[PDB]
Amino acid sequence: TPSYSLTPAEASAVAELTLELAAAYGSFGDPVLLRDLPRLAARLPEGVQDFLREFKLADRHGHTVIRGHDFDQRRIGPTPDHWRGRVRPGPEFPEELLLMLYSALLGEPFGWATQQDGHLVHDIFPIRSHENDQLGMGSKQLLTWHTEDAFHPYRSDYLILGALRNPDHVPTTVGELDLSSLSAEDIDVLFEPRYHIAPDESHLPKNNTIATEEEAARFATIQRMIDERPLGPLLYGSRLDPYMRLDPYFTSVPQDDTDARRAYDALFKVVDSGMREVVADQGDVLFIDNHRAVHGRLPFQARYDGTDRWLKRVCVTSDLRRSREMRATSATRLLG
Amino acid sequence: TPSYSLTPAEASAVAELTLELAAAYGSFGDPVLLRDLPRLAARLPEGVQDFLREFKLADRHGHTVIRGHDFDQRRIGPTPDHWRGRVRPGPEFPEELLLMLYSALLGEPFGWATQQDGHLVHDIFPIRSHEKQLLTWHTEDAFHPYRSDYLILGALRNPDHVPTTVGELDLSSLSAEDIDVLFEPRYHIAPDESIQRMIDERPLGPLLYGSRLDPYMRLDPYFTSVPQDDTDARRAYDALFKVVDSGMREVVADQGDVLFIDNHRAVHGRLPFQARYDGTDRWLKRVCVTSDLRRSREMRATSATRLLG
Ligand SMILES: [Fe+3]
Ligand SMILES: [Fe+3]
């Protein structure tokens, strides 16, 4: 798995850029900043730019890491208790800007309207009231591995995770597909529309307002997937080096299909045993290809004292316009 | 329809950059050029980049034009006889690269392995060999799921000012009943004859999609037919056709203009014109833009190739 280690000079260059940008722009509520992101990202070190571009175009590895970022701990401050009720933007705004610049190198940053007040950069840190919960804000509970939003037609193409701090070196789990570990019959079956992938509860149209024609037409495609229950493949693209969409928790193998179940069990075993622990430490930015890797997080003991693990999260789409029907306006980047 | 008129300084900067790259890189057959394209596009005048980006994200207009590029006629030379067998690149390479840069600002340049020897930049000029003309407009490759998201048309020359037809969708003329029908998968779009399968079961997809208040469209009348027993669908189809046809506009891509067309918000057609067949004839270059290079992976020979088929 190729990575890129920043020299101090590059690290210093990136840090300097993020600071200048943070001073020059007010918040992410500025549409000019979203407009300028790709051009602004051209001012990152050249080696970084070539690296990510090579990662994007190679379409081979399902993750990569850029290590060695200078994340100024004094300026960033204490890990917050909650995301709710924070001044926007925080003093860690430069790091958020960084991840947005990276996101423009891969595609477009986008979000989910119901998630963390629609912030394009998500917070991942322990919250005490979310202790017994399986998500980013958890800690005690194991975050089993998955493709992000496996059922969803407009799911992220890439995820970007930037570790502001991770004092106890808590690893993220990521797994790829070892294609030589599967029989050619199984591959053929997994390529065929023989599986049901269930929506996550947050994507359910009964969760969101049952008001007006306006909002009904916004979930009509999901509603149809729920109603009709179309069956779909779990491997796609090239038969030789395939994309996958695997979330074990929401995948249903039809009982009568003995071939589908045999192949799924083989696909599951290969991916589970292939899982790797990747530690995103302070100043690491982990890039995950959502079509080639799955990801999870191991359980850890939080302290809720402002010294806790803190990652930032940005989701990337390679085609913002493909999801227009699920977005209120053309300008808005929030599905739902 | 917003446009951008380059200052002479912008025009000179673009030209210079254009020529520097034309010496630095060998051809489009250079994988490092394709790699560097978005980085290279960042060296273009900032006001140009900002303009294009506003066009992409606004998702409001079906076309736009960047006007006033300096295209050196002496260096470009004579409009050729044919594209076939012609060695690449020619001396018009600088302008081809400009369009490639613009495509990196919008997404990713791609092409078709069958069409024009599988070149990423396409030639459009009068041919004596391929010579009552009907006036037709279409969505580009309306049938194809991996069709272009944008089209870029750079006018190297157009002495007689022969326009291009471009048409958008006015909804204020269509009833909400027709819209809802055109949104439903009740229409067949015929293919085109222009380990190789892909021949998917192309059945009945919709004509309108995206926002029901501001729809995208895939409209190619010549290859569109409704099932006979679906009378509501044929009523809605006629109403859409009448709306799109009666709204059609003529937009002249003059020498120095690069015309951008949103393949989702606009249909386009060519107008018939008398050519001189010497070497002074209207000459455009076309680059096809995908927003998602990887969505079309199943129809591409390898990972690195941008050619479908
Ligand atoms: Fe997740
Ligand atoms: Fe055409």
Side-chain angles (χ1 to χ4, degrees), chain B residues 3 7-8 23-25 28 39 70 74 84 96 107 125-126 143-144 147 154 165 168 177 181 190 235 243-244 256 267:
Chain B
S3 56
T7 66
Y25 298 93
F28 326 113
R39 187 153 61 76
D70 188 0
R74 177 179 308 116
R84 69 202 302 111
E96 295 184 323
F125 48 61
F143 69 105
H144 217 286
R147 66 190 176 280
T165 46
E168 299 186 10
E177 202 185 319
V181 168
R235 186 200 72 249
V243 155
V244 173
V267 295

PDB file of all heavy atoms in Angstrom, chain B residues 3 7-8 23-25 28 39 70 74 84 96 107 125-126 143-144 147 154 165 168 177 181 190 235 243-244 256 267:
ATOM      1  N   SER B   3     -21.369  34.789 -20.651  1.00  0.00           N
ATOM      2  CA  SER B   3     -20.158  34.464 -21.403  1.00  0.00           C
ATOM      3  C   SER B   3     -18.971  35.195 -20.796  1.00  0.00           C
ATOM      4  O   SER B   3     -19.117  36.027 -19.900  1.00  0.00           O
ATOM      5  CB  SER B   3     -20.312  34.822 -22.878  1.00  0.00           C
ATOM      6  OG  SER B   3     -20.645  36.185 -23.049  1.00  0.00           O
ATOM      7  N   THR B   7      -9.549  39.482 -21.986  1.00  0.00           N
ATOM      8  CA  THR B   7      -8.744  40.659 -22.269  1.00  0.00           C
ATOM      9  C   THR B   7      -7.578  40.194 -23.130  1.00  0.00           C
ATOM     10  O   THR B   7      -7.287  38.998 -23.175  1.00  0.00           O
ATOM     11  CB  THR B   7      -8.137  41.250 -20.985  1.00  0.00           C
ATOM     12  OG1 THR B   7      -7.191  40.320 -20.428  1.00  0.00           O
ATOM     13  CG2 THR B   7      -9.218  41.587 -19.960  1.00  0.00           C
ATOM     14  N   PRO B   8      -6.892  41.127 -23.810  1.00  0.00           N
ATOM     15  CA  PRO B   8      -5.717  40.707 -24.578  1.00  0.00           C
ATOM     16  C   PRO B   8      -4.625  40.063 -23.712  1.00  0.00           C
ATOM     17  O   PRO B   8      -3.921  39.161 -24.169  1.00  0.00           O
ATOM     18  CB  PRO B   8      -5.226  42.021 -25.209  1.00  0.00           C
ATOM     19  CG  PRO B   8      -6.463  42.845 -25.329  1.00  0.00           C
ATOM     20  CD  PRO B   8      -7.262  42.525 -24.094  1.00  0.00           C
ATOM     21  N   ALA B  23       5.285  22.187 -26.421  1.00  0.00           N
ATOM     22  CA  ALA B  23       6.689  21.830 -26.590  1.00  0.00           C
ATOM     23  C   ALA B  23       7.119  20.847 -25.510  1.00  0.00           C
ATOM     24  O   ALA B  23       7.925  19.952 -25.766  1.00  0.00           O
ATOM     25  CB  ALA B  23       7.558  23.079 -26.553  1.00  0.00           C
ATOM     26  N   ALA B  24       6.564  21.008 -24.310  1.00  0.00           N
ATOM     27  CA  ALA B  24       6.939  20.191 -23.150  1.00  0.00           C
ATOM     28  C   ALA B  24       6.432  18.751 -23.242  1.00  0.00           C
ATOM     29  O   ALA B  24       7.125  17.824 -22.824  1.00  0.00           O
ATOM     30  CB  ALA B  24       6.445  20.841 -21.868  1.00  0.00           C
ATOM     31  N   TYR B  25       5.227  18.575 -23.776  1.00  0.00           N
ATOM     32  CA  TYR B  25       4.618  17.247 -23.905  1.00  0.00           C
ATOM     33  C   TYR B  25       4.538  16.822 -25.379  1.00  0.00           C
ATOM     34  O   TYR B  25       4.397  17.661 -26.270  1.00  0.00           O
ATOM     35  CB  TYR B  25       3.226  17.230 -23.259  1.00  0.00           C
ATOM     36  CG  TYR B  25       3.217  17.511 -21.764  1.00  0.00           C
ATOM     37  CD1 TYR B  25       3.035  18.809 -21.276  1.00  0.00           C
ATOM     38  CD2 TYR B  25       3.371  16.483 -20.836  1.00  0.00           C
ATOM     39  CE1 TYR B  25       3.019  19.074 -19.910  1.00  0.00           C
ATOM     40  CE2 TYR B  25       3.354  16.734 -19.469  1.00  0.00           C
ATOM     41  CZ  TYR B  25       3.173  18.035 -19.008  1.00  0.00           C
ATOM     42  OH  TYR B  25       3.149  18.289 -17.648  1.00  0.00           O
ATOM     43  N   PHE B  28      -1.243  13.641 -26.808  1.00  0.00           N
ATOM     44  CA  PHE B  28      -2.206  13.143 -25.807  1.00  0.00           C
ATOM     45  C   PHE B  28      -1.849  11.711 -25.430  1.00  0.00           C
ATOM     46  O   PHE B  28      -2.237  11.223 -24.370  1.00  0.00           O
ATOM     47  CB  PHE B  28      -3.645  13.166 -26.309  1.00  0.00           C
ATOM     48  CG  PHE B  28      -3.952  14.295 -27.233  1.00  0.00           C
ATOM     49  CD1 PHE B  28      -4.249  14.045 -28.572  1.00  0.00           C
ATOM     50  CD2 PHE B  28      -3.958  15.603 -26.773  1.00  0.00           C
ATOM     51  CE1 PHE B  28      -4.543  15.082 -29.437  1.00  0.00           C
ATOM     52  CE2 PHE B  28      -4.255  16.645 -27.633  1.00  0.00           C
ATOM     53  CZ  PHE B  28      -4.546  16.381 -28.965  1.00  0.00           C
ATOM     54  N   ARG B  39      -3.590  20.077 -12.844  1.00  0.00           N
ATOM     55  CA  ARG B  39      -2.553  20.947 -12.306  1.00  0.00           C
ATOM     56  C   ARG B  39      -2.171  22.014 -13.346  1.00  0.00           C
ATOM     57  O   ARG B  39      -2.040  23.204 -13.044  1.00  0.00           O
ATOM     58  CB  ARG B  39      -1.343  20.114 -11.886  1.00  0.00           C
ATOM     59  CG  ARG B  39      -0.270  20.897 -11.155  1.00  0.00           C
ATOM     60  CD  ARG B  39       0.545  20.023 -10.208  1.00  0.00           C
ATOM     61  NE  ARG B  39       1.275  18.943 -10.871  1.00  0.00           N
ATOM     62  CZ  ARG B  39       2.402  19.097 -11.572  1.00  0.00           C
ATOM     63  NH1 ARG B  39       2.945  20.300 -11.739  1.00  0.00           N
ATOM     64  NH2 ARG B  39       2.994  18.035 -12.120  1.00  0.00           N
ATOM     65  N   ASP B  70      -6.627  33.996 -28.625  1.00  0.00           N
ATOM     66  CA  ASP B  70      -5.763  34.281 -29.748  1.00  0.00           C
ATOM     67  C   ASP B  70      -5.404  32.949 -30.378  1.00  0.00           C
ATOM     68  O   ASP B  70      -4.624  32.190 -29.810  1.00  0.00           O
ATOM     69  CB  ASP B  70      -4.505  35.023 -29.267  1.00  0.00           C
ATOM     70  CG  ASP B  70      -3.640  35.542 -30.412  1.00  0.00           C
ATOM     71  OD1 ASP B  70      -4.001  35.336 -31.591  1.00  0.00           O
ATOM     72  OD2 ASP B  70      -2.592  36.165 -30.133  1.00  0.00           O
ATOM     73  N   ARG B  74      -1.666  31.494 -39.051  1.00  0.00           N
ATOM     74  CA  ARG B  74      -0.492  31.029 -39.796  1.00  0.00           C
ATOM     75  C   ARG B  74      -0.009  29.676 -39.270  1.00  0.00           C
ATOM     76  O   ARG B  74       0.140  28.727 -40.028  1.00  0.00           O
ATOM     77  CB  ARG B  74       0.642  32.061 -39.736  1.00  0.00           C
ATOM     78  CG  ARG B  74       1.920  31.615 -40.438  1.00  0.00           C
ATOM     79  CD  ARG B  74       3.021  32.668 -40.383  1.00  0.00           C
ATOM     80  NE  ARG B  74       2.563  33.974 -40.845  1.00  0.00           N
ATOM     81  CZ  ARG B  74       2.506  35.059 -40.078  1.00  0.00           C
ATOM     82  NH1 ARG B  74       2.899  35.000 -38.814  1.00  0.00           N
ATOM     83  NH2 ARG B  74       2.069  36.208 -40.576  1.00  0.00           N
ATOM     84  N   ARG B  84      -8.554  11.056 -41.276  1.00  0.00           N
ATOM     85  CA  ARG B  84      -8.027   9.689 -41.356  1.00  0.00           C
ATOM     86  C   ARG B  84      -6.593   9.667 -41.871  1.00  0.00           C
ATOM     87  O   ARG B  84      -6.259  10.369 -42.825  1.00  0.00           O
ATOM     88  CB  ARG B  84      -8.927   8.802 -42.232  1.00  0.00           C
ATOM     89  CG  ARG B  84      -8.930   9.132 -43.721  1.00  0.00           C
ATOM     90  CD  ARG B  84     -10.183   8.633 -44.443  1.00  0.00           C
ATOM     91  NE  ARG B  84     -10.388   7.182 -44.339  1.00  0.00           N
ATOM     92  CZ  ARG B  84     -11.366   6.582 -43.653  1.00  0.00           C
ATOM     93  NH1 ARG B  84     -12.277   7.286 -42.982  1.00  0.00           N
ATOM     94  NH2 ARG B  84     -11.441   5.253 -43.642  1.00  0.00           N
ATOM     95  N   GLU B  96      -5.649  22.271 -29.248  1.00  0.00           N
ATOM     96  CA  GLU B  96      -6.154  20.988 -28.749  1.00  0.00           C
ATOM     97  C   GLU B  96      -5.916  20.889 -27.248  1.00  0.00           C
ATOM     98  O   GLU B  96      -6.836  20.561 -26.485  1.00  0.00           O
ATOM     99  CB  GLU B  96      -5.497  19.815 -29.496  1.00  0.00           C
ATOM    100  CG  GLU B  96      -5.866  19.769 -30.979  1.00  0.00           C
ATOM    101  CD  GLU B  96      -5.306  18.571 -31.735  1.00  0.00           C
ATOM    102  OE1 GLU B  96      -4.162  18.148 -31.461  1.00  0.00           O
ATOM    103  OE2 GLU B  96      -6.016  18.055 -32.628  1.00  0.00           O
ATOM    104  N   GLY B 107     -14.124  18.027 -15.640  1.00  0.00           N
ATOM    105  CA  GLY B 107     -14.131  16.644 -15.209  1.00  0.00           C
ATOM    106  C   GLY B 107     -12.940  15.910 -15.808  1.00  0.00           C
ATOM    107  O   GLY B 107     -11.791  16.152 -15.432  1.00  0.00           O
ATOM    108  N   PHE B 125     -14.775  19.421 -39.590  1.00  0.00           N
ATOM    109  CA  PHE B 125     -14.611  20.268 -40.766  1.00  0.00           C
ATOM    110  C   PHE B 125     -15.247  19.620 -42.000  1.00  0.00           C
ATOM    111  O   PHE B 125     -15.407  18.395 -42.042  1.00  0.00           O
ATOM    112  CB  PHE B 125     -13.129  20.606 -41.016  1.00  0.00           C
ATOM    113  CG  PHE B 125     -12.191  19.419 -40.970  1.00  0.00           C
ATOM    114  CD1 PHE B 125     -12.324  18.354 -41.856  1.00  0.00           C
ATOM    115  CD2 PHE B 125     -11.133  19.398 -40.075  1.00  0.00           C
ATOM    116  CE1 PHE B 125     -11.442  17.284 -41.821  1.00  0.00           C
ATOM    117  CE2 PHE B 125     -10.250  18.331 -40.033  1.00  0.00           C
ATOM    118  CZ  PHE B 125     -10.406  17.272 -40.906  1.00  0.00           C
ATOM    119  N   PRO B 126     -15.614  20.438 -43.007  1.00  0.00           N
ATOM    120  CA  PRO B 126     -16.269  19.929 -44.210  1.00  0.00           C
ATOM    121  C   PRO B 126     -15.425  18.896 -44.932  1.00  0.00           C
ATOM    122  O   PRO B 126     -14.231  19.111 -45.147  1.00  0.00           O
ATOM    123  CB  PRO B 126     -16.423  21.172 -45.088  1.00  0.00           C
ATOM    124  CG  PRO B 126     -16.399  22.306 -44.145  1.00  0.00           C
ATOM    125  CD  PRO B 126     -15.456  21.900 -43.057  1.00  0.00           C
ATOM    126  N   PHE B 143     -28.871   7.580 -25.617  1.00  0.00           N
ATOM    127  CA  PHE B 143     -29.057   6.190 -25.197  1.00  0.00           C
ATOM    128  C   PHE B 143     -28.059   5.753 -24.132  1.00  0.00           C
ATOM    129  O   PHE B 143     -28.438   5.129 -23.138  1.00  0.00           O
ATOM    130  CB  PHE B 143     -29.001   5.239 -26.417  1.00  0.00           C
ATOM    131  CG  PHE B 143     -27.637   5.117 -27.067  1.00  0.00           C
ATOM    132  CD1 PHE B 143     -26.859   3.972 -26.887  1.00  0.00           C
ATOM    133  CD2 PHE B 143     -27.141   6.130 -27.884  1.00  0.00           C
ATOM    134  CE1 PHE B 143     -25.611   3.846 -27.489  1.00  0.00           C
ATOM    135  CE2 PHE B 143     -25.892   6.011 -28.489  1.00  0.00           C
ATOM    136  CZ  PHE B 143     -25.125   4.864 -28.295  1.00  0.00           C
ATOM    137  N   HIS B 144     -26.796   6.119 -24.335  1.00  0.00           N
ATOM    138  CA  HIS B 144     -25.700   5.613 -23.526  1.00  0.00           C
ATOM    139  C   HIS B 144     -25.778   6.106 -22.075  1.00  0.00           C
ATOM    140  O   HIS B 144     -26.033   7.289 -21.830  1.00  0.00           O
ATOM    141  CB  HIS B 144     -24.370   6.016 -24.149  1.00  0.00           C
ATOM    142  CG  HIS B 144     -23.309   4.969 -24.034  1.00  0.00           C
ATOM    143  ND1 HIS B 144     -22.665   4.699 -22.850  1.00  0.00           N
ATOM    144  CD2 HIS B 144     -22.766   4.138 -24.956  1.00  0.00           C
ATOM    145  CE1 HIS B 144     -21.776   3.741 -23.040  1.00  0.00           C
ATOM    146  NE2 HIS B 144     -21.815   3.384 -24.311  1.00  0.00           N
ATOM    147  N   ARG B 147     -22.730   8.404 -21.450  1.00  0.00           N
ATOM    148  CA  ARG B 147     -22.652   9.517 -22.392  1.00  0.00           C
ATOM    149  C   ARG B 147     -21.929  10.711 -21.763  1.00  0.00           C
ATOM    150  O   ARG B 147     -21.706  10.755 -20.546  1.00  0.00           O
ATOM    151  CB  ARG B 147     -24.059   9.926 -22.873  1.00  0.00           C
ATOM    152  CG  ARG B 147     -24.965  10.503 -21.789  1.00  0.00           C
ATOM    153  CD  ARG B 147     -26.400  10.648 -22.264  1.00  0.00           C
ATOM    154  NE  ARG B 147     -27.277  11.124 -21.193  1.00  0.00           N
ATOM    155  CZ  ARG B 147     -27.789  10.362 -20.229  1.00  0.00           C
ATOM    156  NH1 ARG B 147     -27.526   9.056 -20.177  1.00  0.00           N
ATOM    157  NH2 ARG B 147     -28.573  10.906 -19.305  1.00  0.00           N
ATOM    158  N   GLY B 154     -14.113  24.160 -29.574  1.00  0.00           N
ATOM    159  CA  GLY B 154     -13.199  25.250 -29.867  1.00  0.00           C
ATOM    160  C   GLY B 154     -13.163  25.582 -31.345  1.00  0.00           C
ATOM    161  O   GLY B 154     -12.731  24.767 -32.162  1.00  0.00           O
ATOM    162  N   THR B 165     -26.739  25.078 -33.264  1.00  0.00           N
ATOM    163  CA  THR B 165     -28.038  25.085 -32.592  1.00  0.00           C
ATOM    164  C   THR B 165     -27.896  24.490 -31.204  1.00  0.00           C
ATOM    165  O   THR B 165     -27.245  23.460 -31.011  1.00  0.00           O
ATOM    166  CB  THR B 165     -29.165  24.377 -33.386  1.00  0.00           C
ATOM    167  OG1 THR B 165     -28.705  23.123 -33.886  1.00  0.00           O
ATOM    168  CG2 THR B 165     -29.628  25.251 -34.563  1.00  0.00           C
ATOM    169  N   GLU B 168     -32.557  24.483 -24.731  1.00  0.00           N
ATOM    170  CA  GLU B 168     -32.775  24.193 -23.317  1.00  0.00           C
ATOM    171  C   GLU B 168     -34.241  23.855 -23.088  1.00  0.00           C
ATOM    172  O   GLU B 168     -35.042  23.899 -24.020  1.00  0.00           O
ATOM    173  CB  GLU B 168     -32.356  25.394 -22.460  1.00  0.00           C
ATOM    174  CG  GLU B 168     -30.878  25.739 -22.611  1.00  0.00           C
ATOM    175  CD  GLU B 168     -30.390  26.823 -21.670  1.00  0.00           C
ATOM    176  OE1 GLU B 168     -31.126  27.221 -20.750  1.00  0.00           O
ATOM    177  OE2 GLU B 168     -29.246  27.277 -21.857  1.00  0.00           O
ATOM    178  N   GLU B 177     -48.456  16.977 -15.285  1.00  0.00           N
ATOM    179  CA  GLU B 177     -48.849  15.615 -15.639  1.00  0.00           C
ATOM    180  C   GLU B 177     -47.887  15.023 -16.678  1.00  0.00           C
ATOM    181  O   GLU B 177     -47.459  13.876 -16.553  1.00  0.00           O
ATOM    182  CB  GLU B 177     -50.281  15.627 -16.185  1.00  0.00           C
ATOM    183  CG  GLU B 177     -51.012  14.298 -16.111  1.00  0.00           C
ATOM    184  CD  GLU B 177     -52.385  14.350 -16.770  1.00  0.00           C
ATOM    185  OE1 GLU B 177     -53.110  15.362 -16.601  1.00  0.00           O
ATOM    186  OE2 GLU B 177     -52.745  13.371 -17.461  1.00  0.00           O
ATOM    187  N   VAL B 181     -44.883  11.957 -16.302  1.00  0.00           N
ATOM    188  CA  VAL B 181     -44.876  10.835 -17.237  1.00  0.00           C
ATOM    189  C   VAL B 181     -43.494  10.676 -17.877  1.00  0.00           C
ATOM    190  O   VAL B 181     -42.930   9.576 -17.881  1.00  0.00           O
ATOM    191  CB  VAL B 181     -45.989  10.993 -18.301  1.00  0.00           C
ATOM    192  CG1 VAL B 181     -45.808  10.008 -19.446  1.00  0.00           C
ATOM    193  CG2 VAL B 181     -47.353  10.777 -17.663  1.00  0.00           C
ATOM    194  N   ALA B 190     -32.880   4.169 -29.099  1.00  0.00           N
ATOM    195  CA  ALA B 190     -32.121   3.276 -29.967  1.00  0.00           C
ATOM    196  C   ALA B 190     -30.624   3.619 -29.947  1.00  0.00           C
ATOM    197  O   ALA B 190     -30.255   4.791 -29.840  1.00  0.00           O
ATOM    198  CB  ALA B 190     -32.664   3.333 -31.382  1.00  0.00           C
ATOM    199  N   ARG B 235     -48.300  11.442 -25.699  1.00  0.00           N
ATOM    200  CA  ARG B 235     -48.846  12.793 -25.543  1.00  0.00           C
ATOM    201  C   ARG B 235     -47.841  13.712 -24.854  1.00  0.00           C
ATOM    202  O   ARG B 235     -47.691  14.877 -25.227  1.00  0.00           O
ATOM    203  CB  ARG B 235     -50.142  12.763 -24.733  1.00  0.00           C
ATOM    204  CG  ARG B 235     -50.848  14.113 -24.640  1.00  0.00           C
ATOM    205  CD  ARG B 235     -51.828  14.174 -23.474  1.00  0.00           C
ATOM    206  NE  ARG B 235     -51.151  14.238 -22.171  1.00  0.00           N
ATOM    207  CZ  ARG B 235     -51.139  13.266 -21.255  1.00  0.00           C
ATOM    208  NH1 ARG B 235     -51.776  12.117 -21.467  1.00  0.00           N
ATOM    209  NH2 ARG B 235     -50.488  13.449 -20.109  1.00  0.00           N
ATOM    210  N   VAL B 243     -41.813  21.846 -27.195  1.00  0.00           N
ATOM    211  CA  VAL B 243     -41.240  22.840 -26.280  1.00  0.00           C
ATOM    212  C   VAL B 243     -39.763  23.029 -26.589  1.00  0.00           C
ATOM    213  O   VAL B 243     -39.273  24.158 -26.611  1.00  0.00           O
ATOM    214  CB  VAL B 243     -41.477  22.457 -24.793  1.00  0.00           C
ATOM    215  CG1 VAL B 243     -40.433  23.068 -23.868  1.00  0.00           C
ATOM    216  CG2 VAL B 243     -42.874  22.894 -24.354  1.00  0.00           C
ATOM    217  N   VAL B 244     -39.066  21.925 -26.842  1.00  0.00           N
ATOM    218  CA  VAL B 244     -37.628  21.976 -27.076  1.00  0.00           C
ATOM    219  C   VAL B 244     -37.329  22.535 -28.460  1.00  0.00           C
ATOM    220  O   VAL B 244     -36.471  23.393 -28.599  1.00  0.00           O
ATOM    221  CB  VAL B 244     -36.967  20.599 -26.840  1.00  0.00           C
ATOM    222  CG1 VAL B 244     -35.499  20.600 -27.254  1.00  0.00           C
ATOM    223  CG2 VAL B 244     -37.077  20.236 -25.370  1.00  0.00           C
ATOM    224  N   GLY B 256     -11.829  32.003 -32.181  1.00  0.00           N
ATOM    225  CA  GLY B 256     -11.425  32.456 -30.851  1.00  0.00           C
ATOM    226  C   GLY B 256     -12.410  32.092 -29.753  1.00  0.00           C
ATOM    227  O   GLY B 256     -12.086  32.210 -28.566  1.00  0.00           O
ATOM    228  N   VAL B 267     -29.758  20.407 -25.788  1.00  0.00           N
ATOM    229  CA  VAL B 267     -29.573  19.619 -26.996  1.00  0.00           C
ATOM    230  C   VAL B 267     -28.787  20.469 -27.976  1.00  0.00           C
ATOM    231  O   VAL B 267     -28.815  21.693 -27.887  1.00  0.00           O
ATOM    232  CB  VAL B 267     -30.916  19.167 -27.628  1.00  0.00           C
ATOM    233  CG1 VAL B 267     -31.644  18.208 -26.694  1.00  0.00           C
ATOM    234  CG2 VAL B 267     -31.810  20.356 -27.998  1.00  0.00           C
TER     235      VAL B 267
END
